[PDB]
Amino acid sequence: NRHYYSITINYRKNELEQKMLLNLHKKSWMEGLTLQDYVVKEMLELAK
Amino acid sequence: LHKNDIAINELMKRYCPNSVLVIIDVKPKDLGLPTEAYISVEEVHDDGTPTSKTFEHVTSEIGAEEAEEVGVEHLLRDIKDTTVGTLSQRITNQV
Amino acid sequence: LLKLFTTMELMRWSTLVEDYGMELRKGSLESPATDVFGSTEEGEKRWKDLKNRVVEHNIRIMAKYYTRITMKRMAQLLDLSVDESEAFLSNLVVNKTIFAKVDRLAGIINFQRPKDPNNLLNDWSQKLNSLMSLVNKTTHLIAKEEMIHNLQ
Amino acid sequence: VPGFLQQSQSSGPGQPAVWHRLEELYTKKLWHQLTLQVLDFVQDPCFAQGDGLIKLYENFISEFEHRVNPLSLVEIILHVVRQMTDPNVALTFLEKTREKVKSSDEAVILCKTAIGALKLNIGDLQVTKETIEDVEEMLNNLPGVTSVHSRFYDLSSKYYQTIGNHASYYKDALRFLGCVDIKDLPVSEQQERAFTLGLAGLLGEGVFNFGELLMHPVLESLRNTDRQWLIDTLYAFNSGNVERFQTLKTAWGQQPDLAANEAQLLRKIQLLCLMEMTFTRPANHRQLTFEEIAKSAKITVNEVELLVMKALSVGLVKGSIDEVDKRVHMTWVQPRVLDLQQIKGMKDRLEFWCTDVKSMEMLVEHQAHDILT
16 A cells, blocks of 8 residues: 555446346256256155 | 358358357347357258258356356345255246 | 077077977088087986076066066966976076065066165156156257247 | 261251250350250250260360369260160279369269169179268268269169168168159159058068158158058058058058068057057056957967067067066157147147146145245
8 A cells, every 4th residue: 555545446337237147147057947956765864 | 040140150160160159148038048059060851952051959058167256246246045945946846 | 599689579499499400400510419419418408408598588588577477377488387487486596596576376476676665766766867858848849949930 | 076066967857956056165165055055965865876976075075174073974974875885884984084083073972873873784782882882971071962862872772672671771762852852753753663662661670660751741742643552551550550451451452572571560560559559548547458459459368478578679668568467568658750630639638737737836836925925
């Protein structure tokens, strides 16, 4: 901070792109179709 | 894709043996995981057409990388993650 | 020879004897039928050993298809008496090549499967395996939806 | 040189009219109109002693011109070899045109198809497949012409004449039905094609399905002019299956070549019902009783084993057999083709899964939306 001073960084709204940034991220993370993903008693025997 | 898209790939095959085209979407709407991908091959046809060049669909999937989620995943900030085990699996079922 | 080894199914053992009974008269070279069927004490052992090839190769494919079988049906399928089956049931099971539960009171016998305790694989192969084909529908459906909607 | 075409000027009525232009074609040095007019003379049926005398000058033409594609050079020489009648001295000249002509357009694909065409007198079965396989190796890239692929089917179809894997002929027919869209040949020739095509394709059992593309539009237009009883028994193997009268009908009209495959084709209809009866019905109703197989397939109780277990190796059904009650259990299924009643039968039992699940899925959304919020 001697000989320098920092500067403020704010985001002018890209939200058009930022809205799809959330949609592209979460949809790809939601079971790929939301369908795909949708040790029985034994997983409950390991759970017990 | 208009029919003219056959000539864009064949021109740039000097750069790459097989040029994969990616159809994207600037405005997210429907029905799901967005954009698209095609590959350029020749299957001809069973009916006997002259050799037919038609782009076959390539499954597209989003992926991540280190250090790139810094600013990307920051700006949203409104998402609830996740929660795995209660709401996460059941909302999918309704969908 | 190789026909019985590939795809198996069923054939009358005498028809195999019709083919392998001519090799005695075949020749030119009779030496293949000499070392085998030419010797009386060596042939009778290899004849019953030839039986072990044809009868067990049925048991090998039948163990895959059982489920269950009646004892009387096994006799006409193995082309011999039920008592010869019990002898072929005893000598093959002591080799523990195929697990079998044999009930002689009602005649219902079967090859494996061990009592069906299975739970996970019943539910997993149901939900995981089969529904993967059910959830892959729209995946390649929108792939072909692009195909049909671009031309027509 | 100009005096050579002046003595051959008039071959009869109407011949000189197009030949007066032919002499002005090379003097103007335009080799396209000279290609098409000679090809028009090649297309014009002749003995032909006209194209046989000019083949020496046409050989000299290709020398200094060096450009025009050998495709026109192959089309003229195949009418000339009809006058020569000798495949030996012609193949020496045919390979001569292959080595002397080198261009970006492949001269091997058009020459090798011409070599095997003249090789039918060798007669076959020895050196054929070597020059037959060489075609599609170079033709693999780039098959843009797609017309030479029909010439590739010819010598490939004559390779089948040794009998010769009948099941491969129907697979080789895909290299014909898929070589050119339009027929461009008399349908009466193709109505006797489907004569032996339906037979031979049904004879060889190497192909287990054989009914996939049997509904293709260009072959069924031939099946309209073709003998109707042969098609009605083809629908037995296309859908059928039994239809016991139709599977016998193919043995009524055509006696020969069907004697060895008779009892075999009686086996194919027996494995064709196993997949359909579970496909046609919604089932399950999965496990089947032997008396039902003994009804449809009309087979004795002792032979049901060989029947259904052979289908296990073919791959149309994997279902194990329950031999206590002698009931044959089914797994998976083999779909074949489709029918207008199959789409209507689909919308009945397909959308029924859509309307039943979504109805009770709303019940999952209704009650359980309060505990989520």
